[PDB]
């Protein structure tokens, strides 16, 4: 698969050997940054084939002017038996003809080809945007390596609880250590064709004075010292006198005028607007339209669609277009996973329209946490953003998974396509989530339920999945080859093998030989329970959705209702009175929930599994401090906060 497609190909069935001996012509007149990667490629002389490599107008290149695309970023590639032909209508079109070049190379040899190509959306990356623990700078550093090789040139760098990005030390020039990690970073950033884009986020505490102007244009000129070539005002997630649109235009004017068209050398200069989605806009108010009409014309404007997360529509962004006066430059909130921390986001990246590249700027996605887990996101986005009238959502997912984890491509392929959907959520937003055997899984339990017979070949495959999630589980956790991805995926990992344990059991449930066996499995399965409860008690917990949830759209609910339905029947058939419930809950009392040190009744009575020092009660038809008062019973939202 080559990735991104290109605009162009034309294949031939002969292949050629790499040359051992060759000509290497435009050496020293191309980008610096493709001879190194086609060195590298190479590991010489005047006899032997030619090798032609630099952009338009070098004498390298002067016989392939023609089939050169005149697209910024274009570039002409061809391989036959004579020649290798690397042609850039500008430097990074020649780079982007080495990243081709380089995914053709199969051992030792290549295809015969002809591709011209070029990307479809001029900026074309990731938006390190969300909230959350900030990408370490080993994962950054990965990532922009990353970008380089799938023809991504844009990263924007806007971590909202970095403390020198936003409210208040967006005044503070970075220390010594941090600025020196940055730097670092713009070189990675320049040697992969990429554009460390930074951003500052002052709306929430700016004044509109001399004395905050003067703040943020010295504090871009630090950044413009760390080498910084690209930069950003964010106005998100904000309130109060900083979301005023004649303000916001006015400044970023200001950064135009005395910056950015004063400088030798800015590419890009972007602004995330306040009003920044359709459902975020007051269509009867006057902010886009103040910007659209004051904005300088080369300053973008950022959207993420119809919603804070929705995929992109012709008639969405249509919308935006005419209110901005300019081509929206697409902030896509996914695989962001900020606001369902207890979930992984690997499925495929879809629900994109393929049909209006010229009505975007730019496309951007915002990633999870996770660094490496994203990857599978951020390849796709890069094949869909460069290619998007060929984007193919499930190949590219598949080479996205392979391209990342190639000594164990179909664990991850399995452990990926069942933590996929984000579970209900204030958002709205919804992905699909095993899919393969959902019909399956639907059949399974409507005949069971019913006391109809379910088919034997769907009872297999639900039997087949479980054992494979088992497979897929423990040979990820033992995986060396990306252990940063193992390390970030390793307590969902965790959970996604007890789940699987879980459905094998409840599946041996259902079969239920006799009485004693059928109760050693519901033994099982209640301690695989609490194990459950273990991790999602003891693994991530952040402060907003603490917790380790995996197949939850339709693995997890398949092997609870089958075992609370089991159960039942047990019960009838046996006059007994196990427990049908699915989730271990420590505490009696509707089923209650447990957050970190808080125990809720789901939206009379509690009883707590020991005493605790009572923190508050927060009920809600309004609240309560308990001074460290000793709390096992509570009589009466429905919240009860202890020490623990
Ligand atoms: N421009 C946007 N700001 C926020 C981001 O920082 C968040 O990561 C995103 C997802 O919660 O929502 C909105 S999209």
Not at 265 to 287: A, R
Not at 491 to 515: C, I, S, Y
């Amino acid at each position: 698969s080559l990735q991104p497609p290109p605009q162009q190909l034309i294949v031939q069935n002969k292949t050629i050997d790499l040359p051992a001996v060759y000509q290497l012509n435009g050496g020293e007149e191309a980008n610096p940054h493709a001879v190194k990667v086609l060195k590298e490629l190479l590991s010489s002389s005047k006899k032997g084939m030619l090798i032609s490599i630099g952009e338009k107008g070098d004498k390298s290149v002067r016989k392939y002017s023609r089939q050169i695309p005149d697209h910024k970023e274009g570039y002409y590639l061809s391989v036959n038996e004579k020649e290798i032909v690397l042609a850039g209508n500008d430097e990074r079109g020649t780079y982007y003809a080495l990243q081709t070049f380089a995914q053709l190379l199969k051992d030792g040899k290549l295809p015969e080809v002809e591709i011209k190509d070029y990307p479809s959306v001029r900026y074309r990356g990731v938006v390190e945007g969300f909230y959350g623990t900030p990408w370490s700078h080993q994962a950054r550093l990965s990532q922009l390596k990353f970008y380089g090789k799938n023809k991504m040139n844009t990263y924007i760098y806007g971590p909202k609880d970095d403390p020198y990005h936003s409210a208040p030390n967006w005044r503070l020039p970075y220390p010594d250590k941090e600025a020196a990690q940055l730097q670092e970073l713009v070189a990675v950033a320049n040697e992969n064709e990429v554009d460390f884009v930074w951003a500052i986020h002052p709306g929430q505490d700016i004044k509109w004075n001399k004395e905050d102007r003067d703040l943020l244009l010295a504090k871009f000129e630090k950044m413009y010292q760390l080498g910084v070539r690209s930069f950003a005002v964010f106005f998100d997630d904000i309130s109060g006198e900083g979301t005023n649109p004649q303000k916001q235009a006015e400044l970023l004017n200001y950064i135009d005028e005395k910056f950015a068209q004063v400088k030798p050398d800015i590419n890009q200069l972007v602004m995330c607007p306040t009003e920044y989605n359709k459902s975020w806009s007051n269509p009867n108010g006057n902010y886009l339209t103040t910007l659209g009409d004051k904005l300088n014309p080369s300053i973008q404007i950022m959207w993420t669609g119809d919603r804070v997360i929705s995929d992109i529509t012709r008639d969405g962004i249509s919308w935006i277009n005419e209110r901005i006066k300019r081509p929206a430059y697409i902030w896509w909130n996914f695989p962001v996973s900020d606001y369902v921390r207890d979930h992984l986001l690997l499925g495929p990246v879809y629900g994109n329209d393929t049909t209006i590249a010229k009505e975007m700027s730019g496309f951007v996605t915002n990633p999870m946490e996770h660094a490496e887990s994203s990857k599978i996101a951020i390849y796709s986005v890069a094949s869909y953003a460069w290619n998007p009238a060929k984007y193919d959502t499930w190949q590219t997912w598949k080479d996205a998974i392979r391209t990342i984890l190639p000594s164990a491509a179909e664990e991850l392929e399995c452990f990926a396509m069942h933590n996929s959907d984000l579970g209900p959520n204030g958002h709205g937003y919804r992905r699909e989530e095993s899919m393969d055997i959902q019909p399956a899984a639907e059949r399974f339990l409507k005949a069971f339920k019913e006391g109809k017979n379910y088919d034997k070949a769907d009872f297999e495959t639900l039997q087949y999945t479980f054992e494979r999630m088992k497979e897929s589980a423990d040979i990820l956790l033992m995986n060396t080859e990306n252990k940063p991805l193992i390390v970030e995926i390793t307590p969902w990992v965790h959970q996604f093998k007890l789940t699987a344990e879980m459905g094998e059991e409840v599946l041996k449930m259902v079969e239920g030989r006799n009485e004693s066996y059928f109760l050693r499995k519901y033994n099982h399965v209640k301690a695989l329970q609490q194990q459950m409860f273990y991790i999602d008690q003891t693994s991530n917990q952040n402060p907003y959705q603490p917790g380790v949830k995996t197949a939850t759209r339709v693995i997890k609910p398949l092997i609870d209702r089958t075992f609370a339905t089991v159960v039942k029947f047990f019960n009838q058939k046996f006059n007994a009175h196990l427990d049908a419930t699915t989730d271990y809950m420590p505490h009696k009392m509707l089923p209650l929930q447990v957050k970190a040190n808080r125990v809720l009744i789901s939206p009379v009575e509690i009883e707590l599994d020991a005493i605790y020092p009572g923190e508050n009660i927060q009920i809600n038809f309004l609240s309560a401090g308990l001074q460290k008062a000793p709390v096992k019973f509570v009589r009466f939202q429905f919240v009860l906060t202890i020490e623990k």
